[PDB]
């Protein structure tokens, strides 16, 4: 199908406790493949998936140098943002960055992304045109005017349409046994009375990849959206994900409820019911 | 592969 | 400004007594990133628990997976205990097979 590569940087200041911590992780789809942590005993870009391990020392050395340089730049940006928001030096603050590219089945660029946050709120984002910016507030407009003067968007557009797509295509090939395999969910429904006149039906999906999934309960053929408890999709730790959806139903009406499952790994959507 | 531009605010 | 964690405690594979497994505590939705997570076996902290590399969702909130090998038995009780700036005291969520 279509695929994405994303890097996520977090830069956290901690006045009185040294220089800000910088952590970067990289993902292809829902598979993490690299990490960097400035607090490690010896910080370097390190592999986190088997298919990236074959890259040579020039790759690891270059990525490590780049992550150290980025960590220095983001430490400076945290100082800058403090001034832009008139904040004191006593507090801890966080910059986050996410960027990367999405490609379709043929490997052509579908869209690029470069977005920044400050203290968990939007700060500035490159727009879908890869040539203009949306700033969330007047502080971010100061950055916007600097990046417009320096033509930063042109440099990002060149990365996103070029190296980002090229390297993602390379990773997809080197990791094709896993990055290009969808594992469908194993599904079942459980039933537990909560009282003499109500029972919970819970529809489970386990062992699936990628993480995107839709689990819905219908009663008599109609979606029970407002009435369904859905937990967040969660990682099993072996690459796959898990999710469930639950509905509280009147005793004796269990067979009016059906759970519908949609996942990339299934040829067609699944319908299941409680089977006593 | 990460981007090399890290830009100052 | 701050967001409190969502916490799920669960196993990697469906639990079977006497069969090796992994116990997971997934914390997500939180901001800022500093968080303290312990896995508990009969109320006592389990040593050498591992955790994933810090990352975050589209809405900028953070997530981490803490995990440890374990062998479920009928007797033993497992839990996750989480503290964060948004919480007055550690929150404990019990594992329910």
Numbering used by the authors:
A (entry chain A): 1 to 276
B (entry chain C): 1 to 9
C (entry chain B): 1 to 97
Question: What text appears in the publication on this structure?
Answer:
The human leucocyte antigen (HLA) molecules, encoded by the major histocompatibility complex (MHC) region of the genome, are cell surface glycoproteins responsible for the presentation of both endogenous and exogenously derived peptide antigens for immune surveillance.
To do so we chose two 9mers containing Arg/Lys at P7 (PΩ-2) that formed a natural part of the HLA-B*57:01 peptide repertoire, LSSPVTKSF and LTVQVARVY, and designed P7/9 variants, to utilise in thermal stability experiments. In contrast, the substitution of the P9Tyr for Trp, which is more enriched at this location in ligands of both allotypes, improved the stability of both HLA-B*57:01 (+2.8 °C) and HLA-B*57:03 (+8.6 °C) complexes. HLA-B*58:01 had the most shallow C and D pockets and B*57:03 the shallowest E and F pockets. Instead, due to the reduced E pocket volume caused by the Ser116Tyr substitution, these residues deviated by 9.7 Å and pointed out of the groove. Structural analysis of bound peptide conformation showed a pronounced change in orientation of PΩ-2 Arg/Lys conferred by the Ser116Tyr polymorphism of HLA-B*57:03 that would markedly change the surface presented to T cells.
